[PDB]
Design a protein around this nucleic acid. Structure first.
Ligand SMILES: Nc1ncnc2c1ncn2[C@@H]1O[C@H](COP(=O)(O)OP(=O)(O)NP(=O)(O)O)[C@@H](O)[C@H]1O
Ligand SMILES: [Mg+2]
Ligand SMILES: [Zn+2]
Ligand SMILES: [Zn+2]
Lengths: 635, 97, 616, 156
DNA sequence: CACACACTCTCCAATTCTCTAA
DNA sequence: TTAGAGAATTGGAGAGTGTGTTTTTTTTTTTTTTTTT
């Protein structure tokens, strides 16, 4: 029924060690007491959570052992049963917290009034010719931060390594955050007002559910045998921010033939919204059973479900000068292009085109400034790795296979609807990298058109009559039917994209896996090195770092260059000849889309050289990307 | 029990067929096969049940035909000369004929 | 009280006599004291020989087998009281002192009539210690089960405790404790629950199914549910062939409760598992002796080995030496490179045999399926794209959304044998691309969003679209598949049954010798119930060549590989085909038991690929 | 409704019915301590005819082509079957509130599972919640008798 | 199982009714 | 006629008894019909 046992712990000792630690401890070895100074920030309301570094308590115990006084192994208590010590540290803090030194503007808070009226009522009663639960007045959240390696809270666990033997302990868990709740208020202390006796009473909640009070029990209500009625008041309740998250083990950790298991993480208080889905993270936390309550507790039996209370969070992963440190090296255009995907060797004009997606043309009023590029031709050319490199390099980039539109989605996961924003809405004011572009449904394919023509997508279901703004540059790639491209034939013959779509790109670029003894040796020597030496081979130039490349581009974009008179004079002198030669064999004719294209391309080159406007030494290169693309369609 | 539905040649087109629960007791069980046009004589009855009163929100009673005989609507049916529960039965004065 | 306390001293005298059990207890205790306290941890479990116990006291041994709920408890108490006499440690921690962590028994050998399977296990076996043999399915998720709660009585300083009882925790029946914590003391003090001083044990439920090979005519496989706990948890995964020892036991009221009116339903029945032994022979790996190692090493020196070992694959199948060579290299698969920037390179050789009917395509898939350490059979019509990848389910123990593994996930680090591969539906073939490219499957259904490992080598068989290979038509006319999927295979062998008087005589004599086989010890007409190696040795050779050798690619082989790649490409060959040459060369270097890929390995890789391309 | 007391065999009659089925709270015989255990007399009790018809806002009226909003209309007596699906009708009658009767403690049924109103003897701790419905007294549609002896009397 | 709600049973004392003397 | 003591009936405390509660519901295969393939 209820026997009792001699455990080698005494919480009266350890409460004395904890209060003795808090008042005494200073990290003066960094050359007043650390936690006293911290508590002053709490008392002045400049701070809302107290982080206790377990690595400090070692230095406390080390100093006390060096003084020859045997501190009572406190870290080995609070790793081994962390939950109870959240109560002891809050008691030790409250007993020691200093009076405020800055003005609070006290009477803006409700509890300062309620508890004062409760104080005065007790004096005016008790003249006669705890006071309330302390959790109600704790304006701060306590968290432990675990040991760094210098011990079980140090070693990060995969989710399957967390056996039932770990329950109650402080642990560290490694994984991806797979999903996250919206933040909701949990109650901690519920305040009620009695209608008749005019007296406040508090219920404290420590479970997934609770039962409300309804009938008054204040001294002056029960003494007057008045059946007072209690009503809940949210204004005087204490809530905490609660957010539930799910963590999954990493693909490296799963043993051969198993499935990636998961834990529920509960994050409470100031630590909330520190987790985002797809983070790889180490969460340290207190591992616990969530006990079923009410009828389910009987039938569920001894089989407790479980969760982790978050305590601290470790993510796994000068600007204004660094752009000059690029510029003052010179030849920025060719070096930035050669620095797109440096692992792919050759194909320079493609890299020199793709760079102009990142930078883009200019919008006007509306008229599109965004640039559309379609890569084309043989498989094994690594177009997917190049699209992937642009997805990592580009600001606001999104990779998405055909293997896409926004739509109403009814009961995803929780039993509620959402208007889901497709990849073309994820790519707002950025690059949409659509790989396997021809493996697409007509309902998505014809929704590419409205992103071109209207800079938007439209919805027409469940009464949702909405348009979503969706300005984005499209990078596309496609692969040929019959396994290899036929040089006897057009792109229109090898690929199912119609000219009414295919001719909407500012650049279409045919790139091919052409066999040739030297070119095949140059490729095969690179591949056979990467099987001997696990890092990339010697580039024989130094590339721009992607972070410094992004930092350049964000600054280069906003300069929005304007026309100079010789540009508009010159561009017609090319365009007319391009029309005249298109008069004279596929579909590659000089549409006005190609005039607009040369404009947007020349704008993207003008941005890269950082000026208010630029001379036609620029424009002549934009014409070369187009001219080389057409010669690449023929060969 | 037999769920009995309206005959699709009497159901007005584009409007739903109605049904009733029919109950067959001793010696009437196994008399009709799913998909026959059947003619029932019986007692139309009703009883309380809470599921109606719950979902419909009014004091409304379910209804049941306790069957007392069954006939199968074979022959030409627009015919007064063909009495009885079985139009292909003969009498002794008919077998002799 | 009385008989329990005697059976305790009766088992204590066994542990004193067979001193190897004290030595095993000592070995566990010092190893845990080293790795936990002085510096990955061993369970408090001892496997006793049931044959030592038979010879010490036949009346205790027959008690353990026929009345285990009365003889295993005092035997585990005797073993626990032994380990506490041996245990010494200065200043033990509160969780150790509070642990409720006694010693558990496990058993070896000689079960006799108590050796069973899911079909022969019968109500006459209830409450007996049984060994059951089967294939694992439906492993449920691990949950911690509460077995002791510790409480602290503030205003007194006493730690209280409560123990908990459930019909799957104990061998004997006890009044079931209701899973509710003490909130208030006997005196009326408030109680706080001490997690970490409290005790929980891991718990898992597994379904063990009859091996389909043993199922009687026209009957489908039976199954039993087995309960596993503490350190037996996750010692199994679905598709494991296994032998489980445990007490077969009944549960519940079985409709004897006036809450039910049916009177035809029966009691629930389970095995409480005491031990688990994995198998793979039709024993999950071969343990290798110093003699096995001597033979494997000495045999690897003979220049003919690539012929000796590949001819010892499927010796009943005549011809196809070049396909059987490719199968040997698929079994001794190449090395995987986990390169940075996500650049993971596959080690796994994929083989497609497309060809005329009756050429041993299916009888070489059924050979791979037998000789490989992990192999999963599938067929094109029998496979859904769901059952290849992973299927959504509810775990009936916990009421929760879960994935079951499909054939491509169960085959992780093994082989998938896909027969009838061209009969797969287009929607099911989508699932094969992901595994062959990315060695993984991606799930996005039911509010499960995940990536599963599927690091398996596909061997597949097909026929051309016209039932025999039409030599007057192109490969892309003859072969039904997208050329994208055909590029994910390393070796696309095309095979024909072509008439030739000497070959037809040669294969005809060979199958007539093959049908004349008489298995040793059978009678004439009784119904069944210069160098080659035996298949159990070939299985050891393959296992050694995967656990001991990881060849490094070397300049001698590079000078050959790029010479032969550039020759092939300058007169379907693509960038992927260079990586096939490196896989075949890395695989052959393992057959030679060598740490470096030499010029010989690169030449054999190029000849074997050139055979598959040109039909040399 | 009309009921007979199983305890004393008395009869109660003219028992008006709200949205829930309702037996008498007290026996009419002053010898009888009964407050329950009633049986219906199906001969003496009287039944209206009733029909629910579900109607929606007209497909030409919906202001922007949004979702069509619906209403439950109740027809009684002669007004039943006077409409048909896909038809266009004008109904006149009262707008009514219908209680969610399972929460109102209906004889022999479980409550179901937005916030209602509470604090009533018949609810105890439960909430009562409300649908809007219409109770139509008159119905008109806005959307072969081949004998001259009927047709020439049918015309004016 | 066990813990709230729904509902009946029973006892006890609180209030009002009724009679008597101040 | 007021006012105070003794007798009867009603209110409601509170003890006792009895009932219901977990809860899900997509997913994956197999089929049979329309039509848009
Ligand atoms: N080379 C051979 N040597 C010995 N037996 C052979 C040989 N080729 C085929 N057989 C036998 O022929 C039968 C059919 O072999 P099987 O593997 O089922 O044919 P398959 O090539 O897969 N033909 P199919 O199923 O029609 O596509 C089996 O009994 C084989 O053992
Ligand atoms: Mg076959
Ligand atoms: Zn009150
Ligand atoms: Zn009565």
């Amino acid at each position: 029924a209820l026997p009792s046992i001699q455990l080698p712990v005494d919480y009266n000792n350890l409460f004395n060690e904890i209060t003795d630690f808090l008042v005494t401890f200073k990290q003066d070895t960094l050359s007043g007491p650390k936690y006293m100074a911290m508590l002053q920030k709490v008392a002045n309301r400049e701070l809302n959570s107290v982080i206790i570094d377990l690595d400090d308590i070692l230095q406390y115990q080390n100093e006390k052992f060096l003084q020859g006084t045997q501190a009572d192994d406190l870290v080995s208590a609070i790793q081994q049963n962390a939950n109870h010590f959240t109560e002891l540290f809050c008691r030790a803090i409250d007993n020691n917290m200093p009076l405020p030194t800055k003005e609070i503007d006290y009477k803006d808070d409700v509890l300062d009034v309620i508890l004062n009226q409760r104080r005065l009522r007790n004096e005016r009663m008790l003249s006669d010719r705890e006071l309330f639960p302390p959790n109600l007045t704790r304006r701060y959240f306590l968290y432990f931060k675990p040991l760094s390696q210098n011990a079980i809270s140090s070693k990060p666990l995969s989710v399957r390594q967390i056996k039932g033997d770990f329950l109650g302990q402080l642990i560290t868990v490694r994984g991806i955050i797979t999903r996250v709740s919206d933040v909701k208020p949990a109650v901690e202390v519920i305040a009620y007002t009695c209608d008749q006796c005019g007296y406040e009473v508090f219920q404290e909640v420590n479970s997934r559910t609770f039962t409300p009070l309804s009938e008054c029990t204040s001294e002056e209500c029960s003494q007057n045998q008045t059946k007072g009625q209690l009503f809940m008041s949210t204004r005087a309740s204490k809530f905490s921010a609660f957010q539930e998250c799910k963590i999954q083990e990493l693909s490296q950790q799963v043993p051969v033939g198993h499935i990636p298991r998961s834990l529920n993480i509960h994050v409470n208080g100031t630590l909330v919204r520190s987790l985002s889905p797809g983070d790889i993270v180490d969460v340290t936390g207190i591992f616990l059973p969530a006990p079923y309550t009410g009828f389910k507790a009987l039938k569920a039996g001894l089989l407790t479900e479980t969760y982790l209370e978050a305590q601290f969070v470790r993510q796994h992963k000068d600007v204004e000068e660094r752009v000059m440190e690029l510029i003052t090296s010179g030849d920025v255009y060719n070096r930035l292009a050669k620095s797109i995907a440096p692992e792919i060797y050759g194909n320079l004009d493609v890299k020199k085109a793709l760079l102009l997606l990142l930078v883009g043309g200019v919008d006007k009023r509306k008229i599109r400034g965004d640039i559309n590029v379609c890569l084309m031709g043989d498989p094994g050319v690594a177009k997917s790795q190049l699209l992937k490199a642009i997805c990592k390099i580009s600001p606001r980039g999104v990779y998405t296979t055909g293997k896409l539109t926004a739509a109403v989605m009814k009961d995803p996961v929780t039993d509620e609807m959402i208007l889901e924003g497709g990849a073309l809405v994820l790519a707002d004011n950025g690059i949409c990298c659509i790989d396997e572009f021809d493996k697409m449904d007509e309902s998505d394919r014809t929704a590419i058109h409205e992103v071109m023509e209207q800079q938007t997508i439209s919805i027409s279901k469940a009464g949702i009559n909405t348009t979503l703004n969706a300005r984005t540059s499209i990078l596309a790639a496609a692969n040929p039917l019959y396994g290899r491209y036929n040089p006897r034939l057009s792109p229109l013959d090898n690929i199912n994209l119609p000219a009414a779509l295919l001719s909407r790109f500012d650049i279409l670029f045919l790139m091919l896996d052409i066999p040739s003894r030297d070119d095949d040796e140059k490729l095969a020597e690179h591949v056979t090195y990467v099987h001997m030496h696990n890092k990339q081979p010697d580039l024989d130039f130094t590339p721009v770092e992607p972070s410094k490349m992004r930092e350049y581009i964000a600054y280069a974009k906003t300069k929005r260059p304007v026309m100079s008179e010789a540009v508009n004079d010159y561009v017609v002198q090319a365009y007319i000849r391009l029309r005249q030669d298109s008069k004279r064999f596929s579909f590659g004719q000089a549409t006005p889309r190609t005039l607009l294209g040369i404009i947007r391309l020349s704008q993207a080159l003008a941005k890269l050289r950082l000026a208010d406007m630029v001379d036609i030494d620029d424009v002549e290169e934009a014409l070369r990307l187009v001219r080389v693309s057409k010669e690449s369609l023929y060969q | 029990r037999v769920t009995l539905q309206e005959a699709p040649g009497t159901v007005p087109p584009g409007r739903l067929p109605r049904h009733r629960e029919v109950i067959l007791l001793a010696d009437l069980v196994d008399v009709s096969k799913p998909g026959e046009e059947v003619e029932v004589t019986g007692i139309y009855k009703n009883n309380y049940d809470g599921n109606l009163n719950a979902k419909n929100g009014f004091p409304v009673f379910a209804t049941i035909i306790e069957a007392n005989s069954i006939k199968r609507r074979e022959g030409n049916t627009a015919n007064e000369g063909e009495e009885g529960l079985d139009v292909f039965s003969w009498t002794e004065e008919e077998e002799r004929e | 009280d009385a008989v329990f306390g005697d059976r305790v001293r009766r088992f204590q005298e066994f542990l004193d006599t067979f001193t190897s059990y004290r030595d095993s207890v000592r070995s566990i205790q010092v190893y845990n004291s080293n790795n936990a306290a002085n510096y990955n941890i061993l369970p408090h479990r001892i496997i006793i020989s049931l044959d030592d116990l038979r010879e010490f006291d036949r009346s205790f041994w027959s008690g353990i087998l026929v009345e285990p709920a009365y003889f295993i408890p005092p035997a585990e108490k005797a073993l626990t009281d032994l380990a506490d006499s041996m245990d010494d440690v200065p200043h033990p921690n509160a969780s150790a002192v509070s642990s409720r962590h006694p010693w558990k028994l496990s058993f070896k050998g000689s079960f006799g009539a108590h050796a069973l399977s899911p079909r022969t296990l019968t109500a006459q076996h209830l409450n007996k210690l049984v060994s059951v043999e089967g294939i694992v399915t439906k492993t449920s998720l691990v949950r911690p089960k509460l077995i002791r709660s510790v409480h602290y009585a503030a205003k007194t300083g006493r730690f209280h405790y409560r123990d908990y009882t459930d019909a799957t925790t104990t061998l004997t029946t006890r009044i079931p404790t209701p899973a509710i914590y003490p909130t208030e003391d006997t005196e009326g003090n408030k109680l706080t629950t001490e997690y970490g001083y409290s005790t929980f044990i891991d718990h898992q439920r597994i379904t063990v199914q009859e091996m389909p090979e043993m199922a009687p005519a026209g009957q489908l496989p039976r199954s039993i549910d087995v309960i596993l706990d503490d350190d037996l948890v996750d010692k199994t995964k679905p598709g494991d062939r296994v032998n489980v020892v445990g007490v077969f036991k009944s549960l519940g009221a079985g409709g004897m409760n006036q809450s039910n009116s049916n009177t035809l339903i029966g009691f629930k029945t389970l095995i409480l598992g005491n031990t688990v032994y994995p198998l793979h022979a039709r024993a999950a790996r071969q343990m290798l002796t110093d003699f096995d190692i001597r033979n494997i090493n000495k045999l690897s020196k003979k220049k003919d080995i690539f012929d000796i070992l590949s001819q010892s694959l499927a010796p009943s199948i005549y011809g196809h030496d070049h396909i059987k060579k490719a199968i040997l290299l698929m079994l001794m698969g190449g090395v995987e490179k986990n390169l940075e920037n996500g650049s993971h390179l596959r080690g796994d050789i994929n083989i497609l045999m497309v060809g005329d009917p009756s050429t041993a395509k299916s009888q070489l898939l059924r050979f791979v399926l037998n000789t490989a350490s992990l192999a999963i059979a599938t067929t094109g019509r029998g496979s859904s794209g769901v059952g290849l990848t992973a299927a959504v389910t509810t775990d009936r123990e916990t009421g929760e959304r879960r994935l079951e593994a499909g054939a491509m996930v169960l085959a992780d680090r093994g082989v998938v044998c896909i027969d009838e591969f061209d009969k797969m539906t287009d929607v099911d073939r989508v699932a094969i691309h992901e595994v062959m490219e990315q060695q993984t499957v991606t799930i996005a259904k039911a509010g499960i969003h995940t990536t599963l490992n599927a690091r398996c080598s596909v061997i597949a068989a097909a026929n051309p679209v016209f039932g025999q290979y039409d030599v007057n038509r192109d490969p892309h006319q003859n072969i039904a598949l997208p050329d994208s999927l055909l590029s994910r295979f390393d070796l696309l062998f095309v095979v024909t049954d072509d008439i030739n008087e000497i070959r037809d005589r040669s294969i005809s004599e060979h199958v007539l010798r093959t049908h004349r086989y008489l298995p040793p010890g059978y009678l004439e007409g009784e119904p069944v119930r210069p160098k080659l190696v035996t298949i159990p040795f070939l299985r050891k050779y393959v296992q050694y060549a995967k656990e001991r050798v990881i060849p490094q690619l070397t300049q001698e082989a590079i000078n050959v590989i790029v010479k032969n790649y550039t020759d092939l490409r300058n007169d379907p060959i693509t960038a992927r085909t260079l990586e096939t040459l490196i896989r075949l060369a890395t695989a052959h270097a393992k057959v030679r038991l060598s740490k470096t890929v030499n010029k010989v390995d690169a030449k054999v890789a190029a000849n074997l690929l050139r055979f598959a391309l040109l039909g040399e | 409704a009309s009921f007979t007391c199983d305890m004393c065999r008395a009869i109660v009659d003219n028992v008006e019915q709200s949205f829930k089925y309702t037996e008498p709270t007290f026996c009419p015989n002053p010898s009888c301590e009964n407050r329950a255990f009633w049986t219906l007399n199906v001969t003496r009790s009287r039944f209206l005819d009733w029909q629910k018809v579900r109607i929606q806002e007209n497909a030409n009226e919906i202001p922007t082509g949004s979702m069509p909003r619906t209403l439950d209309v109740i027809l009684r007596g002669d007004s039943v079957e006077r409409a048909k699906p896909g038809d266009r009708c004008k109904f006149t009658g009262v707008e009514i509130v219908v209680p969610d009767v399972t929460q109102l403690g209906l004889p022999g049924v479980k409550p179901s599972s937005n916030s209602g109103v509470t604090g009533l003897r018949s609810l105890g701790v439960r909430d009562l919640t409300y649908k809007i419905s219409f109770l139509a007294c008159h119905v008109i549609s806005i959307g072969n008798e081949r004998d001259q002896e009927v047709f020439l009397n049918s015309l004016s």
